[PDB]
Amino acid sequence: PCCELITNISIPDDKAQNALSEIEDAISNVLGKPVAYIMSNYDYQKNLRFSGSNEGYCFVRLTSIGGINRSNNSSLADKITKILSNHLGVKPRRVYIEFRDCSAQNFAFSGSLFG
Amino acid sequence: PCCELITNISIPDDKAQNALSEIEDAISNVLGKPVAYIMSNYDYQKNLRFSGSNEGYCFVRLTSIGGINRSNNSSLADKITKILSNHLGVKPRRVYIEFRDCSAQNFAFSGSLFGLE
Amino acid sequence: PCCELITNISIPDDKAQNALSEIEDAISNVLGKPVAYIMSNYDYQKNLRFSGSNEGYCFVRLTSIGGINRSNNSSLADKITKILSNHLGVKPRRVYIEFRDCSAQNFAFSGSLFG
Known about the structure:
Chain B: One of its GO terms (molecular function) is dopachrome isomerase activity. Three copies of one chain form a homotrimer. The first copy, chain A, is an alpha/beta fold. Chain A contains two helices and seven strands, in the order E-H-E-E-E-H-E-E-E. In chain A, strand 6 and strand 7 (112-113) form a beta hairpin. In chain A, helix 1 (13-31) packs antiparallel against helix 2.
């Protein structure tokens, strides 16, 4: 799975990595997908806006081959939002999360398709 | 909705904010979605290329829970492209826009999924 | 087509664009699409993580209106991974590629829908 965090909140690299690691743990726990396949990123975007302002805000896009369903999505939305509020100080009402279900045939690793 | 602008065109932060605000207004007008629900971003990507060169270019990805259809897409393609050319100086022929639909069950706000039930 | 490269490997702009040019060539060949239609990007993301570490890694998202299929995906997965290993020094096993199909109705160019 892939976890893209896009935020106008700035924290040092170790603390950014710490937050990603906790999100990775939640993804591992809820989806049951192996660490080997988990990607995460903290993309600092100074011009990011939500609700017509540049106030602190986070958007997460989570892409997964399966595991995208009401139960998992609700669990991860709760967990990920809490992690972000804790480590980045973002208001829960300034956190959006998108869940994307993708097909195995549309992914490649080390130059070959999963199939 | 989420509106991700990716461009190799450098403009001052205040001007980037102004352009994003105008795009937000167009999105609200066409899709009927309140600004309160709109995310937008100006992602300066200096090495972004189109048609084999690093010449001025904009790519926009617009994601919305519904409202993705021929009439709305056409209207927003026209409105957004005009805003970009005006504010950024990009040539319309170097503006790409992608439209993405999302189900409410696959989108969360304040730690909870959108939709009922 | 659009090819978004996201990587925690930093290289100078001239070298970044060279890698992109080679990727563009490969895309043009495999998908039978002229360079005129190809967008590419090199997005340096220093905090990007894969498999639980911040070690050198490349993620590629390739979006096309059609041309997303086993043969094309397989061929491009092979070609793009080789390019990235050659040009960026990344290990093939830390190259992850996502292929996306987009409808022509959901893409616009020059202010008008495709096309």
